Amino acid sequence: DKICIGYHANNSTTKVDTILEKNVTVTHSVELLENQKEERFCKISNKAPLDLRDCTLEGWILGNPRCGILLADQSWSYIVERPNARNGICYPGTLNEAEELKALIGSGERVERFEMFPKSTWTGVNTESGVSSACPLGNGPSFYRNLLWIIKLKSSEYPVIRGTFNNTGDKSILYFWGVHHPPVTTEQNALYGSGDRYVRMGTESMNFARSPEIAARPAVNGQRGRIDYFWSILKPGETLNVESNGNLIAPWYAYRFVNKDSKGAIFRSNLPIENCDATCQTTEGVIRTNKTFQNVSPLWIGECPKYVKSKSLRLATGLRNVPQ
Amino acid sequence: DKICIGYHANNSTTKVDTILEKNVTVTHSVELLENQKEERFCKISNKAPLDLRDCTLEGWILGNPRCGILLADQSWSYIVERPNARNGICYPGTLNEAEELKALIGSGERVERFEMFPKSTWTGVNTESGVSSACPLGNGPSFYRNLLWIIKLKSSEYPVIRGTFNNTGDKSILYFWGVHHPPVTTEQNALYGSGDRYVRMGTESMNFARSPEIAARPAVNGQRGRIDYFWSILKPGETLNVESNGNLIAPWYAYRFVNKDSKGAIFRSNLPIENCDATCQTTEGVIRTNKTFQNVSPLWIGECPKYVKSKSLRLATGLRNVPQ
Amino acid sequence: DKICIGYHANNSTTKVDTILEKNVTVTHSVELLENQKEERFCKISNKAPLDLRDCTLEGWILGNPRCGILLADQSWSYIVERPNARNGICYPGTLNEAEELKALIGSGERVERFEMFPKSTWTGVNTESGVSSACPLGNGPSFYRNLLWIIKLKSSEYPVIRGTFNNTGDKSILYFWGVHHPPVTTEQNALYGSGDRYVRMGTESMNFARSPEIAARPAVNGQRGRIDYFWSILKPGETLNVESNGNLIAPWYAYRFVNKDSKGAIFRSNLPIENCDATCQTTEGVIRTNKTFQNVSPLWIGECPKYVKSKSLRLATGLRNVPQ
Amino acid sequence: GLFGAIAGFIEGGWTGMIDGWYGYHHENSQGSGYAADKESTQKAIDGITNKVNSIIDKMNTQFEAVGHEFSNLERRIDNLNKRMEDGFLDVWTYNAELLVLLENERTLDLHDANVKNLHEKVRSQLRDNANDLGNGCFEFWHKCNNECMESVKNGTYDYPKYQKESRLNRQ
Amino acid sequence: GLFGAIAGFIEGGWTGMIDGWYGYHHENSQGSGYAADKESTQKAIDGITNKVNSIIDKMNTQFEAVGHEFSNLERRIDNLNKRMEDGFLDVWTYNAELLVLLENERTLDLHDANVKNLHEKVRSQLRDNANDLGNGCFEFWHKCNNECMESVKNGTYDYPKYQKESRLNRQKI
Amino acid sequence: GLFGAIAGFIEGGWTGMIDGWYGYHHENSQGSGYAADKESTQKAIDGITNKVNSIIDKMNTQFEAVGHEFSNLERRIDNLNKRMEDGFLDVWTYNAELLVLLENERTLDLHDANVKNLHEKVRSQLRDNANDLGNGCFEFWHKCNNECMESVKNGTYDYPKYQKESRLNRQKIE
Ligand SMILES: *[C@@H]1O[C@H](CO)[C@@H](O[C@@H]2O[C@H](CO)[C@@H](O[C@@H]3O[C@H](CO)[C@@H](O)[C@H](O)[C@H]3NC(C)=O)[C@H](O)[C@H]2NC(C)=O)[C@H](O)[C@H]1NC(C)=O
Ligand SMILES: *[C@@H]1O[C@H](CO)[C@@H](O[C@@H]2O[C@H](CO)[C@@H](O)[C@H](O)[C@H]2NC(C)=O)[C@H](O)[C@H]1NC(C)=O
Ligand SMILES: *[C@@H]1O[C@H](CO)[C@@H](O[C@@H]2O[C@H](CO)[C@@H](O)[C@H](O)[C@H]2NC(C)=O)[C@H](O)[C@H]1NC(C)=O
Ligand SMILES: *[C@@H]1O[C@H](CO)[C@@H](O[C@@H]2O[C@H](CO)[C@@H](O)[C@H](O)[C@H]2NC(C)=O)[C@H](O)[C@H]1NC(C)=O
Ligand SMILES: *[C@@H]1O[C@H](CO)[C@@H](O)[C@H](O)[C@H]1NC(C)=O
Ligand SMILES: *[C@@H]1O[C@H](CO)[C@@H](O)[C@H](O)[C@H]1NC(C)=O
Ligand SMILES: *[C@@H]1O[C@H](CO)[C@@H](O)[C@H](O)[C@H]1NC(C)=O
Ligand SMILES: *[C@@H]1O[C@H](CO)[C@@H](O)[C@H](O)[C@H]1NC(C)=O
Ligand SMILES: *[C@@H]1O[C@H](CO)[C@@H](O)[C@H](O)[C@H]1NC(C)=O
Ligand SMILES: *[C@@H]1O[C@H](CO)[C@@H](O)[C@H](O)[C@H]1NC(C)=O
Ligand SMILES: *[C@@H]1O[C@H](CO)[C@@H](O)[C@H](O)[C@H]1NC(C)=O
Ligand SMILES: *[C@@H]1O[C@H](CO)[C@@H](O)[C@H](O)[C@H]1NC(C)=O
């Protein structure tokens, strides 16, 4: 008659690491780190992301004529921009504070496109014929759909033109404008005229004034001229006054802007956007797991596990496996 | 006859959490986290804080005419700014590098108000009548107390005025100035005159020159015009040369600045300031404790416990309590 | 007859700290923290560092005439700048984006000095005589070796001058230019001429324009005038167009820039550079160790141990030492 | 530290015991068999479940990097952002990886202590009524039926009941 | 791990022992009573105080957020600062909360080991002169007066002194 | 955490045992001597080495501060950078200093457990054939030559072999 005290053992070959010993076989353990992903984009909270397709984010929001599919109301959970989108800033020049603009839009949830200043706003000038071969639509020359390139009338001089918008809505307005810089004096006099020219924007809280900087530049997209693009936010209740006697790239269409109540994201990726659901969406793909860590990506939207460099984080729950 | 070995037990019902078991009753323990606060502001190091009251921080330092209560030397342990202060930059326009200015003053300990350029500095001109309804004191028009709005004499031209200040003291000098932009050519010619006008400031390390950018702007406080406000630090040993033939909002009173030898703070809060003393002052209130952590606020001045999100951090010191 | 079980003891007086008891003698232990340094600078990856000697980093890169020893091809593992170098920006003025320039250079490994725009580029103007007593070479007055100071001829007016550089190489080009700001209008008309003057630079990706800012200033290095210094990177394949009608401080010599493929460093130190080799180089000196932590400096370039505040980090490996 | 039981004086485990981590093997006239110790197994499971959940619960926050962009004149704040993100990455990687090493040691030792305590709980009961073989087994100096065996597992072994019979087996 | 004493083979604690964590209960002709073992109790107090002080001392720094402000064109560095402040906040929240859990376990286990060690120290002394009941108690095979009890508590129990009387009560039964 | 052996019921260490951390001292007709238990010692050495290496391996990253400069109008991001660099410094100092304290306790307790376990291993073998002095020593109730001593150390002690002689030397005494 006898009784023995002992412990469980099985065919487990799963190992864990300890501080005193590595590769230790245990009876039961749990993996805390997730390394698997669906290389694609899904919906967050049943709301689809915005595909910018063959347009860069500047080209979309400025209204590059080749971005027509995107020229409408848009609602996104997050934004996907493609690495080598052809359609961006077609007419050469720098968008001022570009990075802050992308950051703002990333914090956005919805935009509503509307006509801020119709062509009839500007009197004494040519609101047509403001197109360029650098911004083609089809074969013919064209221009941005959110901007109006104004040149003087051939019969008359370029007068002081003015525009005013009272923002009476509850939503902030994202609008754009520009200043054209011809390469030589001849073009300046031909399009706008001699003497001192100016572009002046003003709101209750914003003050903007620039002059033409005529200078010879290397050709970009067949253009030795440049346009300095600018953006700003018309606060609700605020009013914008536009005043210029030349070189004005006028705001035409603008957006009613809706701020996202949480962090938004802009992913730079070639992954496909599909009609699927995800809780965790990384820039490298979807993660479906109950695990506590992932080694997939630090950039994500939604609810994801913590990012670490580890290949594995396995906690022992069971006992040291010692079969007979 | 017998002897037993045993362990202490008492009437304690205080519990702690362990990695293996929660709500574990122990005989003795110590709480490391503090969650109690006095919702008020007290003095730090026997020095009272500066309450800006119904004035914003720009309104105080520029000398908004309705901030007379603050119009003096100021010494603070920290600064309390009120959320809905009415009196700030009364005349519409942008203060350049506003945020860096607040950061600088926040790092300050004392300012001494003094007269930098007396009205006699500027000759041939009208040093009175530089007021606006946009900066009212009572019903009548007025202006900032640290700035001098200089307009031409009606009888005469606006001559070139000049000013010079050598900072031979040991303290850096915080001073302000501005450039006025009248809305229409009429006001420009009437206040300063036609032709090219300029505002010129220069030190050993700073070079400033501007011209008026006349433009019609939306009305703020009945004003279509703007003032571009500027601030700077005149280093000890440096010298300031002021030169202008128009549109100059001249430095009148300025500050000798005292650097705080430690971290300073500016709290945006509605809490009442009382005659009390504190070692730890947070933006949410006073903390009086020897505990190592607090649950109150990450923004504070003085000697405070570390901020964490925890509701409780109780270390067991005694043993598992098993009463009989 | 007996057998006893026991444990090792020795003459160790080395102590470690435990959570329950301090100053505890143990038989064997290892120190993890390194606190010794060789107060000198050595070579990293068998490449010597660049000593700036009596020149500041701006003085070197702008080509201050007293920095002649450093004006050549340079390849460095890191840079050593001396605290009180006398030779910096000799002619008074501000270097635009100075800190970003230093950050750029710090991430660099090699520069190749070459002549970008020869004096013959600018015709109709005086390309000689562009010197100053504030920038002496030897005893006589001079000017930067990478910049060309252009003033007008008395015989003719100062024409619109132009220059072009095609970057057809594979290396980026770091180049400099400036805008001169005379203290008074007289000098402006004498050096450049009346009317509106401008300096305009442009590439495929950059658009630059400034005008003279005449203002009365204190004398610095015997000069009341100022030069606003600017820098930029001409990308491979890009082209620079220079166009100005006055006040132009032209690029003369420039650098082909090579980006370091790892972290670079700029140490501000008085330590001697010697004929030695190192794996770990801190700003406070050389560290030779197998230890995991160091007490020396958070600023270093090679492969260094982790920096902590600790005076000692000694792990017990052996046993509690209890000699009889 | 090691408690000497698991892979110690009890040299190996039992693949025959499938209903628990810790337990007994008995032999008598009514047969033999494995039986898991009901008390200690559940308590160990509760503790380890709590430990795993607590660890998960404390790791239930995330440092979220952003995809914000920076210009060529923002090299410093670009790098500032990078060193911060890499900084927290290295901290949390350190925390997770080290926690696993240290706590796996504790988990294995916890079982070791549970096995030792279970053995001692039995050894304390049987006293001189049984012969300690030193390998986790006890040979009885008396007949121990299924109910007797059962009492040992229950921790209610009646020592003086079998005391006479055990002592009265001196050869 | 558990050392099997506290809430183990010694099922409960004593509300009658108020002058120490660990100690004895005796019974003899001169009555009964509790007496704390001062040596082991004091040693535990010294360790736990040191543990608490050391933990506080390592927590004796603070990450200080500031109230600096940012313009609408400074959204990126605003967010950088917020993510940093929240970042260090999450690290120290983790460190404190996890350290408390782990060390509370160690503290409770420490007391368990101290009680276990104290029990074995006595058991080593009495040997077969006393009967181990398995519940932390020892029935003496001989008369053990107050002086005898004190010697057990003092750790100076004279074993061969009581040996014969002890064996002559094992042979009597 | 203490296992009661080191500086416990085994009151002191042996400076005479120089070839290991844990071990034996025996006495018989053939003399005395120290002998380290190589098995348990080597196992501890592998473990402690492993512990030290693992710690070093996890500390094998560095937060690298840089020498970037900031203008007088860049006070905020200057301070931002400073609070960050100081921030990670305080985190790693905390991690390093606290880890040394906590694991030093564990390492010292580990040795204590190893000595305890080795002692129990002997006590389990000898059973009632030897007299437990309570100080880590065992007086044999029989003659135990070098070959017998080795078996106790070898873990191959033959208990029933010496049972009769041993029990036949407890009643002779008393
Ligand atoms: C575990 O410990 C045992 C105790 O010492 C070792 O076994 C005994 O000692 C010797 C080593 O094996 C053997 O010696 C041989 O046999 C007799 C002694 O009994 C001698 O006369 C012989 O000369 C000798 N052989 C030779 C080739 O000289 C003993 O036989 C043996 N005795 C018993 C009872 O086991 C074990 O070796 C040891 N195991 C190890 C070290 O792995
Ligand atoms: C995620 O969920 C799975 C399944 O619900 C968990 O895996 C199982 O957990 C139960 C409980 O211990 C076991 O019966 C199974 O053997 C487990 N399977 C595997 C493959 O481990 C898993 O533990 C959960 N993950 C986390 C981190 O909690
Ligand atoms: C632990 O050891 C330290 C040093 O070994 C002792 O305290 C200090 O001892 C030396 C004196 O030469 C120096 O480190 C310090 O000046 C001492 N500390 C002082 C003066 O505050 C002491 O033995 C122990 N530490 C204590 C008791 O705090
Ligand atoms: C197994 O053990 C339990 C206790 O752990 C026994 O239950 C106790 O029985 C006695 C009577 O003999 C009662 O006085 C106690 O109140 C009971 N304990 C409890 C907690 O209620 C049980 O009888 C034992 N034997 C079995 C189950 O066969
Ligand atoms: C795996 O386990 C089974 C029983 O579950 C048994 O065959 C044996 O333990 C293992 N298999 C083999 C082939 O040994
Ligand atoms: C454990 O396995 C790993 C596999 O990557 C490898 O380091 C080696 O085989 C083992 N490590 C040690 C220390 O034995
Ligand atoms: C338009 O702006 C003016 C500001 O002068 C405001 O009073 C008016 O109410 C606005 N119109 C609305 C809100 O319909
Ligand atoms: C018991 O309960 C109350 C308060 O908890 C009080 O009588 C006393 O302080 C407590 N403790 C003791 C030891 O009496
Ligand atoms: C005890 O029970 C649970 C913990 O898991 C919780 O709901 C409860 O609040 C705990 N007690 C206290 C006082 O928090
Ligand atoms: C905190 O202070 C109180 C009274 O000032 C004191 O009794 C208590 O022990 C202190 N706690 C700590 C952890 O120092
Ligand atoms: C320990 O003993 C060695 C023997 O070589 C001796 O040299 C040394 O001075 C002693 N003390 C220390 C601290 O090493
Ligand atoms: C010179 O620059 C021109 C400017 O567009 C361009 O064609 C090319 O990059 C350069 N020419 C050659 C032959 O490399």
Author numbering:
A (entry chain A), B (entry chain C), C (entry chain E): 1 to 324
D (entry chain B): 1 to 171
E (entry chain D): 1 to 173
F (entry chain F): 1 to 174
Task: Cite, word for word, the article reporting this structure.
Receptor-binding specificity of HA is a key determinant for viral host range. Two H6 HA proteins, one from each group, were chosen for structural and functional investigation: A/chicken/Guangdong/S1311/2010(H6N6) (GD H6) in Group I and A/Taiwan/2/2013(H6N1) (TW H6) in Group II.
In order to investigate the atomic interactions of H6 HAs with avian-like receptors, we used the pentasaccharide, α(2,3)-linked lactoseries tetrasaccharide a (LSTa), for crystallographic study. The stronger interactions between GD H6 HA and LSTa are consistent with their relatively higher binding affinity compared to TW H6 HA with LSTa. On the other hand, different from the small hydrophobic residue V190 in TW H6 HA, GD H6 HA has a large hydrophilic residue E190 that interacts with the O9 atom of Sia-1. In the GD H6 HA-LSTa complex, the combination of S137, E190 and G228 results in a much deeper location of LSTa inside the receptor-binding site, thus allowing additional interactions with Y98, H183 and Q226. In this conformation, the hydrophilic residue Q226 helps stabilize the hydrophilic glycosidic oxygen (O3) atom of LSTa in trans conformation. For instance, the side-chain carboxyl group of E190 forms a strong hydrogen bond with the Sia-1 O9 atom of both LSTa and LSTc of GD H6 HA.
